[PDB]
Scaffold this active site. Structure first.
Site, PDB file in Angstrom:
ATOM      1  N   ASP A  25       8.982  29.844 -37.010  1.00  0.00           N
ATOM      2  CA  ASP A  25       7.952  29.197 -36.474  1.00  0.00           C
ATOM      3  C   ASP A  25       8.075  28.943 -34.838  1.00  0.00           C
ATOM      4  O   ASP A  25       9.163  28.505 -34.323  1.00  0.00           O
ATOM      5  CB  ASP A  25       8.121  27.373 -37.075  1.00  0.00           C
ATOM      6  CG  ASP A  25       6.995  26.813 -36.234  1.00  0.00           C
ATOM      7  OD1 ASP A  25       5.696  26.882 -36.342  1.00  0.00           O
ATOM      8  OD2 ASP A  25       7.263  25.821 -35.281  1.00  0.00           O
ATOM      9  N   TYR A  29       7.527  26.545 -26.210  1.00  0.00           N
ATOM     10  CA  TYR A  29       8.902  26.270 -26.215  1.00  0.00           C
ATOM     11  C   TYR A  29       9.600  27.190 -25.222  1.00  0.00           C
ATOM     12  O   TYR A  29      10.822  27.045 -25.091  1.00  0.00           O
ATOM     13  CB  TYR A  29       9.235  26.805 -27.579  1.00  0.00           C
ATOM     14  CG  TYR A  29       8.716  26.016 -28.945  1.00  0.00           C
ATOM     15  CD1 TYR A  29       7.970  24.769 -28.431  1.00  0.00           C
ATOM     16  CD2 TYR A  29       8.920  26.503 -30.164  1.00  0.00           C
ATOM     17  CE1 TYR A  29       7.287  24.011 -29.659  1.00  0.00           C
ATOM     18  CE2 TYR A  29       8.254  25.669 -31.268  1.00  0.00           C
ATOM     19  CZ  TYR A  29       7.518  24.575 -30.815  1.00  0.00           C
ATOM     20  OH  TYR A  29       6.743  23.992 -32.065  1.00  0.00           O
ATOM     21  N   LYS A  31       1.754  28.984 -31.641  1.00  0.00           N
ATOM     22  CA  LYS A  31       0.813  27.688 -31.359  1.00  0.00           C
ATOM     23  C   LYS A  31       0.301  27.931 -29.855  1.00  0.00           C
ATOM     24  O   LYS A  31       0.758  27.923 -28.876  1.00  0.00           O
ATOM     25  CB  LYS A  31       1.528  26.617 -31.518  1.00  0.00           C
ATOM     26  CG  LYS A  31       2.342  26.447 -32.793  1.00  0.00           C
ATOM     27  CD  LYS A  31       2.920  24.903 -32.863  1.00  0.00           C
ATOM     28  CE  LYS A  31       4.083  24.858 -33.987  1.00  0.00           C
ATOM     29  NZ  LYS A  31       5.094  25.719 -33.803  1.00  0.00           N
ATOM     30  N   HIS A  66      -2.035  23.793 -31.256  1.00  0.00           N
ATOM     31  CA  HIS A  66      -0.781  22.989 -31.346  1.00  0.00           C
ATOM     32  C   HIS A  66      -0.862  21.391 -31.498  1.00  0.00           C
ATOM     33  O   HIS A  66      -0.275  20.588 -32.130  1.00  0.00           O
ATOM     34  CB  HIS A  66      -0.181  23.371 -30.087  1.00  0.00           C
ATOM     35  CG  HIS A  66       1.355  22.975 -30.197  1.00  0.00           C
ATOM     36  ND1 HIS A  66       2.422  23.700 -29.850  1.00  0.00           N
ATOM     37  CD2 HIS A  66       2.066  22.039 -31.005  1.00  0.00           C
ATOM     38  CE1 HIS A  66       3.509  22.872 -29.787  1.00  0.00           C
ATOM     39  NE2 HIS A  66       3.375  22.285 -30.850  1.00  0.00           N
TER      40      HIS A  66
HETATM   41  N1  LIG Z   1       4.050  21.482 -34.288  1.00  0.00           N
HETATM   42  C1  LIG Z   1       4.390  20.484 -33.497  1.00  0.00           C
HETATM   43  O1  LIG Z   1       3.847  20.026 -32.614  1.00  0.00           O
HETATM   44  C2  LIG Z   1       5.894  20.328 -33.671  1.00  0.00           C
HETATM   45  C3  LIG Z   1       6.428  19.198 -33.210  1.00  0.00           C
HETATM   46  C4  LIG Z   1       7.981  19.071 -33.273  1.00  0.00           C
HETATM   47  C5  LIG Z   1       8.764  19.991 -34.111  1.00  0.00           C
HETATM   48  N2  LIG Z   1       7.951  21.300 -34.468  1.00  0.00           N
HETATM   49  C6  LIG Z   1       8.726  22.669 -35.248  1.00  0.00           C
HETATM   50  O2  LIG Z   1       9.777  22.041 -36.197  1.00  0.00           O
HETATM   51  C7  LIG Z   1      10.968  22.509 -35.995  1.00  0.00           C
HETATM   52  C8  LIG Z   1      11.990  21.813 -36.461  1.00  0.00           C
HETATM   53  O3  LIG Z   1      11.787  20.396 -35.794  1.00  0.00           O
HETATM   54  P1  LIG Z   1      12.729  19.796 -34.680  1.00  0.00           P
HETATM   55  O4  LIG Z   1      13.275  21.046 -34.173  1.00  0.00           O
HETATM   56  O5  LIG Z   1      11.890  18.910 -33.728  1.00  0.00           O
HETATM   57  O6  LIG Z   1      13.727  18.710 -35.201  1.00  0.00           O
HETATM   58  P2  LIG Z   1      14.557  18.851 -36.760  1.00  0.00           P
HETATM   59  O7  LIG Z   1      14.479  20.391 -37.533  1.00  0.00           O
HETATM   60  O8  LIG Z   1      14.286  17.857 -37.545  1.00  0.00           O
HETATM   61  O9  LIG Z   1      16.087  18.826 -36.202  1.00  0.00           O
HETATM   62  C9  LIG Z   1      16.707  19.698 -35.786  1.00  0.00           C
HETATM   63  C10 LIG Z   1      18.088  19.118 -35.145  1.00  0.00           C
HETATM   64  O10 LIG Z   1      18.943  19.054 -36.237  1.00  0.00           O
HETATM   65  C11 LIG Z   1      20.191  19.789 -36.305  1.00  0.00           C
HETATM   66  N3  LIG Z   1      20.353  20.315 -37.550  1.00  0.00           N
HETATM   67  C12 LIG Z   1      20.057  21.485 -37.952  1.00  0.00           C
HETATM   68  N4  LIG Z   1      20.527  21.856 -39.240  1.00  0.00           N
HETATM   69  C13 LIG Z   1      21.411  20.953 -39.241  1.00  0.00           C
HETATM   70  C14 LIG Z   1      22.442  20.963 -40.284  1.00  0.00           C
HETATM   71  N5  LIG Z   1      22.187  21.377 -41.483  1.00  0.00           N
HETATM   72  N6  LIG Z   1      23.295  19.846 -40.307  1.00  0.00           N
HETATM   73  C15 LIG Z   1      23.232  18.923 -39.253  1.00  0.00           C
HETATM   74  N7  LIG Z   1      22.314  18.993 -38.293  1.00  0.00           N
HETATM   75  C16 LIG Z   1      21.222  20.009 -38.315  1.00  0.00           C
HETATM   76  C17 LIG Z   1      19.915  20.569 -35.029  1.00  0.00           C
HETATM   77  O11 LIG Z   1      21.080  21.148 -34.297  1.00  0.00           O
HETATM   78  P3  LIG Z   1      21.457  22.523 -34.088  1.00  0.00           P
HETATM   79  O12 LIG Z   1      20.224  23.279 -33.703  1.00  0.00           O
HETATM   80  O13 LIG Z   1      22.271  22.489 -32.686  1.00  0.00           O
HETATM   81  O14 LIG Z   1      22.239  23.088 -35.179  1.00  0.00           O
HETATM   82  C18 LIG Z   1      19.115  19.919 -34.389  1.00  0.00           C
HETATM   83  O15 LIG Z   1      19.911  19.047 -33.409  1.00  0.00           O
HETATM   84  C19 LIG Z   1      11.015  22.791 -34.428  1.00  0.00           C
HETATM   85  O16 LIG Z   1      11.894  23.667 -34.000  1.00  0.00           O
HETATM   86  C20 LIG Z   1       9.655  23.276 -34.189  1.00  0.00           C
HETATM   87  O17 LIG Z   1       9.544  24.599 -34.538  1.00  0.00           O
HETATM   88  C21 LIG Z   1       6.763  21.188 -34.330  1.00  0.00           C
HETATM   89  O1  LIG Z   2       8.149  21.471 -31.320  1.00  0.00           O
HETATM   90  C1  LIG Z   2       7.393  20.740 -30.497  1.00  0.00           C
HETATM   91  N1  LIG Z   2       6.084  21.155 -30.284  1.00  0.00           N
HETATM   92  C2  LIG Z   2       5.559  20.378 -29.409  1.00  0.00           C
HETATM   93  O2  LIG Z   2       4.498  20.354 -28.960  1.00  0.00           O
HETATM   94  C3  LIG Z   2       6.580  19.066 -29.249  1.00  0.00           C
HETATM   95  C4  LIG Z   2       6.016  17.569 -29.908  1.00  0.00           C
HETATM   96  C5  LIG Z   2       5.729  16.786 -28.725  1.00  0.00           C
HETATM   97  O3  LIG Z   2       6.578  16.597 -27.646  1.00  0.00           O
HETATM   98  C6  LIG Z   2       6.935  17.845 -26.922  1.00  0.00           C
HETATM   99  C7  LIG Z   2       7.277  18.054 -25.672  1.00  0.00           C
HETATM  100  C8  LIG Z   2       7.685  19.107 -25.201  1.00  0.00           C
HETATM  101  C9  LIG Z   2       7.646  20.237 -25.695  1.00  0.00           C
HETATM  102  F1  LIG Z   2       8.160  21.428 -25.038  1.00  0.00           F
HETATM  103  C10 LIG Z   2       7.455  20.317 -27.366  1.00  0.00           C
HETATM  104  C11 LIG Z   2       7.066  19.112 -27.899  1.00  0.00           C
HETATM  105  N2  LIG Z   2       7.637  19.660 -30.033  1.00  0.00           N
END
Ligand SMILES: NC(=O)c1ccc[n+]([C@@H]2O[C@H](COP(=O)([O-])OP(=O)(O)OC[C@H]3O[C@@H](n4cnc5c(N)ncnc54)[C@H](OP(=O)(O)O)[C@@H]3O)[C@@H](O)[C@H]2O)c1
Ligand SMILES: O=C1NC(=O)[C@@]2(CCOc3ccc(F)cc32)N1
Length: 315
Positions: A43, A48, A77, A110
């Site tokens: 993803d 990013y 996105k 997005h």
């Molecule tokens: N569409 C949108 O607007 C949107 C918004 C937010 C997120 N997203 C997507 O969703 C993905 C995941 O969400 P997120 O990155 O916001 O948060 P997340 O996956 O809920 O949390 C990532 C965090 O958890 C840690 N982590 C991962 N695996 C772990 C494990 N097995 N044990 C302990 N800790 C662990 C990571 O540390 P390390 O990385 O240091 O291991 C990092 O600090 C994003 O990367 C992005 O691709 C999309």
């Molecule tokens: O993974 C993510 N996609 C996004 O749009 C989001 C969620 C909302 O807030 C931010 C802010 C900055 C960014 F780079 C990203 C984001 N996180």
């Protein structure tokens, strides 16, 4: 089925690697590790600021014949400053170029919020509010459909759309393609069963972002509830001799939701793939669902007054 199937027929892998906050010098290695571990869905997103480096990792694996392009599900996105119809193809082409890919499997709008175009991803005014633009996501969608027609993307979807915003697309005069996906924030503290149910009634797959409640989100002011340190999930994890993390990933899968956990740490990327070997007993599923505090980690509060801000609605 280790994957869900989009209305196009395309098999969308149920677990994927998330790359937000994944720093450029770490993400090429994370992507590489992940594909070696069997991950076939990545993803990504222009905003990013790492798609080039995601591109390098994929590239290596592709020319190294470790995977074939047809076996990869790369999502990216369209960012908010690129919502004007004429800006959409260019934004997709930059992404294709940085990912070094001829097509994407899924390209998502997005956020429903379009911001003033320019290089700054969040154009702010004197009050600190983000500056809107003259566009409606229905027009953006019309340009997104052109990407399908030209073969640049295999499917299009949306992210963070509330059910009334998805409806506006579905009821669009002259709609060519529906959202195939709605990627939204899902985790025990925001279970979203009503939006999930709506998307599923419409045949739109849901991807749950932030399954672990984003421990590393920049704004994690210490008195923020941590899902990973939540004693309750740690207990149900214990029952399986699995980590909080593995349990929190199994949960959306079990709800027929695609999960995309983010990790740049090799060991945790392996851990996060080691979830397809058990099933949470339905009581535990019900426990987790009950924690719905409606707590949003990604609320995009800076855009709360935008006409298309998605979160004032119930779902
Ligand atoms: N569409 C949108 O607007 C949107 C918004 C937010 C997120 N997203 C997507 O969703 C993905 C995941 O969400 P997120 O990155 O916001 O948060 P997340 O996956 O809920 O949390 C990532 C965090 O958890 C840690 N982590 C991962 N695996 C772990 C494990 N097995 N044990 C302990 N800790 C662990 C990571 O540390 P390390 O990385 O240091 O291991 C990092 O600090 C994003 O990367 C992005 O691709 C999309
Ligand atoms: O993974 C993510 N996609 C996004 O749009 C989001 C969620 C909302 O807030 C931010 C802010 C900055 C960014 F780079 C990203 C984001 N996180």
């Amino acid at each position: 089925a280790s994957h869900l199937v989009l209305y196009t027929g395309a098999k969308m892998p149920i677990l994927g690697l998330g790359t937000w906050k994944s720093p450029p010098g770490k993400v090429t290695e994370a992507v590489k590790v992940a594909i070696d571990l069997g991950y076939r869905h990545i993803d990504c997103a222009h905003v990013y600021q790492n798609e080039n480096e995601v591109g390098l990792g994929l590239q290596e694996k592709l020319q190294g014949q470790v995977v074939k392009r047809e076996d990869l599900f790369i999502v990216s996105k369209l960012w908010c400053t690129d919502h004007e119809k004429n800006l959409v193809k260019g934004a997709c082409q930059t992404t294709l170029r940085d990912l070094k890919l001829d097509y994407l499997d899924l390209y998502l709008i997005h956020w429903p919020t379009g911001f003033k175009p320019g290089k700054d991803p969040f154009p702010l005014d004197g009050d600190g509010n983000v500056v809107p633009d003259e566009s409606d996501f229905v027009e953006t969608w019309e340009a997104m459909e052109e990407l399908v027609d030209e073969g640049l993307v295999k499917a299009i979807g949306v992210s963070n759309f509330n059910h009334l915003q998805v409806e506006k697309i579905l009821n669009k005069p002259g709609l060519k393609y529906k959202p195939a996906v709605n990627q939204i924030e899902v985790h025990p503290y925001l279970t979203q069963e009503k939006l999930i149910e709506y998307c599923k009634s419409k045949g739109i797959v849901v991807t749950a972002y932030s399954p672990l409640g984003s421990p590393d989100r920049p704004w994690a002011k210490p008195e923020d509830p941590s899902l990973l340190e939540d004693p309750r999930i740690k207990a149900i994890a214990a029952k399986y001799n699995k980590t909080t993390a593995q349990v929190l990933i199994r949960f959306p899968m079990q709800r027929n939701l695609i999960v995309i956990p983010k990790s740049v740490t090799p060991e945790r990327i392996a851990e996060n793939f080691q979830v397809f070997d058990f099933e949470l007993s339905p009581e535990d599923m019900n426990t987790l669902l009950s924690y719905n505090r409606n707590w949003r980690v990604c609320a995009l509060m800076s855009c709360a007054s935008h006409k298309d801000y998605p979160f004032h609605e119930e779902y």
